[PDB]
Structure formats: structure tokens, C-alpha cells
């Protein structure tokens, strides 16, 4: 996990187009017609982790190995969803514990453009200031979504610094990043916020919420995976 067959080129509003297939765990969650409503991350061949607010159902599909959603010829994997596991602790009012697991009906076929992201340990500590990366097909301007997968490098923020803006709206299962000239935006939800752990890209956050206009000077908020990974492991073990 966490090691793309195709290396990404570094250096979402104000982000940059990604190298095709360089974020192999990134999936597009679409409805039965092919409409992209959220992103997600493959954690293995049978499971995808996304945000609870995305409201995924078994009628939706997981599209893996995609880069250009505007390309009808591009080879991808349209995977059916067998069951949806929404974290029962998801708070629809505070948005805390914003995570959902999707169990695929048919396993994804891993390859050069399709693989898993690593999961952190509940005790992992990704220091504030650490430069991480988020990806997705969300808006690039606050409008239709970009056809090609976007990416952006951004710093993790300390809870104290994040609260300087969001105050008490920041809960224990949330981690902030951004306010650095880039911003996740409509369509990016459920997607990954990854940071390197011993060189391997590890899922530190799941795009959740933030500025209602995707302001690049405001902290973006993500579901804190370290606070939710035990729930993840437990769900996989029981299913």
C-alpha cells in the first residue's frame, strides 16, 4: 500500500492536474448514470473508505483507475457496492466521525493504476506543518467539475490554529489542513488527504467540510483517520 506504480509529480481550487494514475487508490463515487458526487480511497481490493455525508448507497458505483472523466475510451473499473457501513457515531449535526466504508460486490483488480492507500495506526502523530496531499475531481473554481484528476500539496494545521477560525466547530475526529492558497471543494468530499509515513502514502484525512465558497485562506476540515481507524479495522474484521 501507499506506493504508486506511477510516481506523482508535486508542485480542488488552485491545485494542479495529476499525472495519470499516480494516485491509484483514488476512486470516483458515481450514481447509476455516471454522475460523480464524491471521491473515495481504496484500502484493499474489497473495501473503499469515504465520507459519511456522501450518503453512498448500494445503488451507487465505485469507479477505479480513472483519470479523465470526460474520456469515454479510458479504461476503468466500474465496481458495484455490496454493502455500505456508515459509522454509527457519525454526527449529522456537528459532522464529527464523518466516515463510511464500502464493501465491493466484486473485488477490484489491482494494477499499475489501481491499488490501495495505507492506513495509519490510531497512535500515529502527523505533526502540524507537515506537507501532505489531497486529490479529487471537485470544483477548481467556486460551475462544472474538471474532467481530469487534480491534486494539491497543503500543510496540516494544529487544532489550536484551526480553531482560531472555526472555533468550537472543530471536534475530536476532525483534522484541518490548507488555508495555504489551495482548497478542497464541491465534489472532493470522501477523497483522500495523504501524508508520507516511512515513505508510504498513508490516509490521514478524508475530505469533509470547510469554507462554503472554498476560500484558499480558510482551513479545510477532514475526518481524522487516526481517530477512526480502529472502527475501520473492526468493521473489516467482522465483515
Amino acid at each position: 500500500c501507499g506506493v504508486p506504480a506511477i510516481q506523482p509529480v508535486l508542485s480542488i481550487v488552485n491545485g494542479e492536474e495529476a499525472v495519470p494514475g499516480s494516485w491509484p487508490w483514488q476512486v470516483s463515487l458515481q450514481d447509476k448514470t455516471g454522475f460523480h458526487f464524491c471521491g473515495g480511497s481504496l484500502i484493499n481490493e474489497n473495501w473503499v473508505v469515504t465520507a459519511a455525508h456522501c450518503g453512498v448507497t448500494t445503488s451507487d458505483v465505485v469507479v477505479a483507475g480513472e483519470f479523465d472523466q470526460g474520456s469515454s475510451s479510458e479504461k476503468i473499473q466500474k465496481l458495484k457496492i455490496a454493502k455500505v457501513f456508515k459509522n454509527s457515531k457519525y454526527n449529522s449535526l456537528t459532522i464529527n466521525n464523518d466516515i463510511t466504508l464500502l464493501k465491493l460486490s466484486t473485488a477490484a483488480s489491482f494494477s499499475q493504476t489501481v491499488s490501495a492507500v495505507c492506513l495509519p495506526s490510531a497512535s500515529d502523530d502527523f505533526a502540524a506543518g507537515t506537507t501532505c496531499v489531497t486529490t479529487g475531481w471537485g470544483l477548481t473554481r467556486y460551475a462544472n467539475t474538471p474532467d481530469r484528476l487534480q491534486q494539491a500539496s497543503l500543510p496540516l494545521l494544529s487544532n489550536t490554529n484551526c480553531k482560531k477560525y472555526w472555533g468550537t466547530k472543530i471536534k475530536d475526529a476532525m483534522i484541518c489542513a490548507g488555508a495555504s492558497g489551495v482548497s478542497s471543494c464541491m465534489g472532493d468530499s470522501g477523497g483522500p488527504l495523504v501524508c508520507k509515513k516511512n515513505g508510504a502514502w498513508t490516509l490521514v484525512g478524508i475530505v469533509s467540510w470547510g469554507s462554503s465558497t472554498c476560500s484558499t485562506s480558510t482551513p479545510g476540515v477532514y475526518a481524522r483517520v487516526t481517530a477512526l481507524v480502529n472502527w475501520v479495522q473492526q468493521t473489516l474484521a467482522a465483515n
Binding site: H53, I95, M186, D188, S189, W209, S212
Partner: peptide, 10 residues
């Protein structure tokens, strides 16, 4: 009202 979350739900 779109809201603060970043999904793209019709």
C-alpha cells in the same frame, strides 16, 4: 442551500 460539506449531490 449547498451547505459547508464538499460533496456534489443532486
Amino acid at each position: 442551500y449547498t451547505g459547508p460539506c464538499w460533496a456534489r449531490i443532486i
